[PDB]
C-alpha cells in the first residue's frame, strides 16, 4: 500500500515511507573493505562493512563509494547497499511495497535498465517508478515556475521549468560538486603543512568542509583582509587531539564553483550557467524564472551563497529586473520530500510500472513511458 522512496545520491542515501515529512534512514553510500592481516580468532568473518559502521571503522579500511557523478559503476556493492537500506535500516520487505527512485538528468540509459532489472528480478518489487531529482524540489517548494539548481555530492545540474512543462533544450549539467571541493581543500592544506592523503582522512576533510567553510560576498577584498589579519582564522580539533589552524582556505575552496579554473576545468561556472540556461528559454518566460530561482542539495548550504548569487547574476541580467532566490532550511531533503508528496497522491496508481508489464516488454519500459 504505502510506497517507499529513496534518492540514492552519490554521497548520502536517504529513504523512508511515503507521506512522511523527514526521513528515518540517513547513511552514506559506502562499502568498506579491510586491508590488513587478521590475527584474533572469531573477529573477522565480515568481508564488508556498510554505511555508518564502515565510517566508524574507517581506520582499518578502504572505503569505496560505488557511485560517481550520478552514475553507478560497481553493481555488487550497490546491491549490498540496497539490501542494507530495505532490511537492516527500514525494517521492511520489498515484495509487497512499491518503490520510487531518482537520478540526475542526462544519465546513461543503461543505468535505468539495470535498476529495473535488479528490482523486478532480485527484489521482486511489485511496482516501480523513476523520477528526476530536480522536479521533486518544486513539489517540495509548492511551486511550478522556477529553476531548480541541484548541487549535490557528485553532480550539479540545472533545470528550468514553467507551469508544469520542462524546457529540455535548456538543461545543463556540471561535474563540480562537494567532492571536487573536498579534494581541492585537501590539496590546499599541504600549504600549511597538514597532509591528508588517505580515504578516512578525506572523510575528516569533509567534516571540516561542512563546519568551517563559507562563501565570500567579495572574494578579493576578503582575500586581502585575510592576508592582513588573523581574525578570520579558526582552529579545529582532529580525532587524535591534534589541532589544525585554517585561514583563507575557508572561502578559497567554495569559490571554485564560481571560478572552476582553479582546478583546471574549463567551464562556465554556476553564476554563468544559470544565466545561459535562461537565455535559451523563450523571452516571455525568462521573468518568472529570474524571480523564482530555487536551490537544493547540500553544497547549497554554505553561508553566503544566496547573497552572492544575487550579487552575481544581477550583474549579468538587465536592470529593472527582479532577481529573487529561494533557499529554505529544508534543503538536502526537498528532493526526497517531493518524492514523499508524490507517492501519497492518487493519480500515480496509473503511473507505476508494474511487474507484468516488465514481464512483457522488459527494461525498455522506463524509456517508453518513464
Amino acid at each position: 500500500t504505502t510506497a517507499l522512496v529513496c534518492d540514492n545520491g552519490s554521497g548520502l542515501v536517504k529513504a523512508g515511507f511515503a507521506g512522511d515529512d523527514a526521513p528515518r534512514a540517513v547513511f552514506p553510500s559506502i562499502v568498506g573493505r579491510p586491508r590488513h592481516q587478521g590475527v584474533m580468532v572469531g573477529m573477522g568473518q565480515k568481508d564488508s562493512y556498510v554505511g555508518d559502521e564502515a565510517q566508524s571503522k574507517r581506520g582499518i579500511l578502504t572505503l569505496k563509494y560505488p557511485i560517481e557523478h550520478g552514475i553507478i559503476t560497481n553493481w555488487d556493492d550497490m546491491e549490498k547497499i540496497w539490501h542494507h537500506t530495505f532490511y537492516n535500516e527500514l525494517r521492511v520487505a520489498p515484495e509487497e511495497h512499491p518503490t520510487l527512485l531518482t537520478e540526475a538528468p542526462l544519465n546513461p540509459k543503461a543505468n535505468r535498465e539495470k535498476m529495473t532489472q535488479i528490482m523486478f528480478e532480485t527484489f521482486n518489487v511489485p511496482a516501480m517508478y523513476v523520477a528526476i531529482q530536480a522536479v521533486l524540489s518544486l513539489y517540495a517548494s509548492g511551486r511550478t515556475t522556477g529553476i531548480v539548481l541541484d548541487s549535490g555530492d557528485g553532480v550539479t545540474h540545472n533545470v528550468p521549468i514553467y507551469e508544469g512543462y520542462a524546457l529540455p533544450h535548456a538543461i545543463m549539467r556540471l561535474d563540480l560538486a562537494g567532492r571536487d571541493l573536498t579534494d581541492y581543500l585537501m590539496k590546499i592544506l599541504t600549504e600549511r603543512g597538514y597532509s591528508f592523503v588517505t580515504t578516512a582522512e578525506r572523510e575528516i576533510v569533509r567534516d571540516i568542509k561542512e563546519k568551517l567553510c563559507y562563501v565570500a560576498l567579495d572574494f578579493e577584498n576578503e582575500m586581502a583582509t585575510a592576508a592582513s589579519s588573523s581574525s578570520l582564522e579558526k582552529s579545529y580539533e582532529l580525532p587524535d587531539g591534534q589541532v589544525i589552524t585554517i585561514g583563507n582556505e575557508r572561502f578559497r575552496c567554495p569559490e571554485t564553483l564560481f571560478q572552476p579554473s582553479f582546478i583546471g576545468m574549463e567551464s562556465a561556472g554556476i553564476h554563468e550557467t544559470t544565466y545561459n540556461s535562461i537565455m535559451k528559454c523563450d523571452i516571455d518566460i525568462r521573468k518568472d524564472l529570474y524571480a523564482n530561482n530555487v536551490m537544493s542539495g547540500g553544497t547549497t548550504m554554505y553561508p553566503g551563497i544566496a547573497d552572492r548569487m544575487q550579487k552575481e547574476i544581477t550583474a549579468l541580467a538587465p536592470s529593472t529586473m527582479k532577481i529573487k532566490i529561494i533557499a529554505p532550511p529544508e534543503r538536502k531533503y526537498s528532493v526526497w520530500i517531493g518524492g514523499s508528496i508524490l507517492a501519497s497522491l492518487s493519480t500515480f496508481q496509473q503511473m507505476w510500472i508494474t511487474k507484468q508489464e516488465y514481464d512483457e516488454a522488459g527494461p525498455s519500459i522506463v524509456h517508453r513511458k518513464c
Binding site: 580468532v41 572469531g42 573477529m43 568473518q45 565480515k46 564488508s48 562493512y49 556498510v50 554505511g51 559502521e53 549490498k80 539490501h83 542494507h84 530495505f86 532490511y87 537492516n88 535500516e89 525494517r91 520487505a93
Partner: protein
C-alpha cells in the same frame, strides 16, 4: 508481567521483547540489547521457526571470565550463519561482533525477520497450502460469531469494534465455553483504560487457552491491520476443525 516503559526505549522494542517473553523463553528478558549478547535466546528461537541447531557447536553459557567474549562470539557467528545459509535471511552487513557488541540496529535487523518467519510458518499452518489472507479468515470468524449469537461481524480488520476488544471476547467465548468473567464486558467502553482492561484481559485469556497471542492492548485499542490480523490468525490457531 511487569509491563512498562524502560529507561529510554522505543515502541518497536517493546513489541519485540513481548514477542520473546510471550514465547516461552527460559531467561526473563529485562531488555534486549544486554540479554541477547550470548545469543542463546536466538538459538531457542530458531527451533521455533523450524530451523535446526547444532547444540554441540553451541557453547554453553560463558561462565569463565577468561573464555567470556570469545565463546559468545563463536555463538553469535554460528547464529548469523544459521540466519544466512539454511533459513535464508538477508544479513548482508552483519556478523558476530554486532550481536555481542549490542548494536541497536542490526540486532533488530535479525529479529524482525525471525518474527516474520514465525508468522509465515503459522500462516501456512492455518490453511494447508502456502498462504492465507483476510478473505478466508474474515469468513470463518464471522461464521463463528454467527454460531454463538453473541455479537457483530468483522467487516474489516479496521473495524472500530475492536477498539473495545468486545469482538475478540465474544469470539474467545464463541470457540470455547463461558470459561470467562463477563462483568468486564461493559458497553460504552469509552475510557481508554477500560478498553485497555478488556484488551489485557483478552490477550491474557487467549494465552490461557493456548492461542499464541503476543499483542499489546495498545495494538487493539488502536486498530492496526497487520497486527490485529495476526491476533485473529493465531486464534485460528489452537482449534478450527
Amino acid at each position: 508481567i511487569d509491563w512498562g516503559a524502560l529507561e529510554g526505549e522505543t515502541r518497536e522494542e517493546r513489541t519485540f521483547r513481548n514477542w520473546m517473553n510471550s514465547l516461552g523463553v527460559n531467561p526473563r528478558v529485562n531488555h534486549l540489547y544486554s540479554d541477547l549478547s550470548d545469543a542463546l535466546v536466538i538459538f531457542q528461537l530458531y527451533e521455533k521457526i523450524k530451523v535446526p541447531v547444532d547444540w554441540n557447536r553451541v557453547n554453553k553459557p560463558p561462565y569463565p571470565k577468561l573464555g567470556g567474549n570469545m565463546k559468545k562470539l563463536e555463538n553469535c557467528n554460528y547464529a548469523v550463519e544459521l540466519g544466512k545459509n539454511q533459513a535464508k535471511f538477508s544479513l548482508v552487513g552483519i556478523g558476530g561482533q554486532d550481536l555481542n557488541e549490542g548494536n541497536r540496529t542490526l540486532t533488530l535487523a535479525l529479529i524482525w525477520q525471525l518474527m516474520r518467519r514465525y508468522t509465515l510458518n503459522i500462516l501456512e499452518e492455518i490453511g494447508g497450502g502456502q498462504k492465507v489472507n483476510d478473505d478466508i479468515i474474515v469468513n470463518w470468524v464471522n461464521e463463528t460469531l454467527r454460531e454463538a449469537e453473541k455479537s457483530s461481524s468483522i467487516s474489516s480488520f479496521k473495524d472500530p469494534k475492536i477498539s473495545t476488544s468486545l469482538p475478540v471476547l465474544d469470539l474467545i467465548d464463541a470457540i470455547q465455553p463461558g470459561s470467562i468473567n463477563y462483568d468486564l464486558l461493559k458497553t460504552e467502553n469509552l475510557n481508554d483504560d477500560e478498553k485497555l482492561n478488556n484488551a489485557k484481559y483478552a490477550i491474557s485469556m487467549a494465552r490461557k487457552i493456548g492461542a499464541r497471542v503476543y499483542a499489546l492492548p495498545e495494538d487493539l485499542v488502536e486498530v492496526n491491520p497487520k497486527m490485529v490480523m495476526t491476533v485473529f490468525a493465531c486464534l485460528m490457531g489452537k482449534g478450527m476443525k
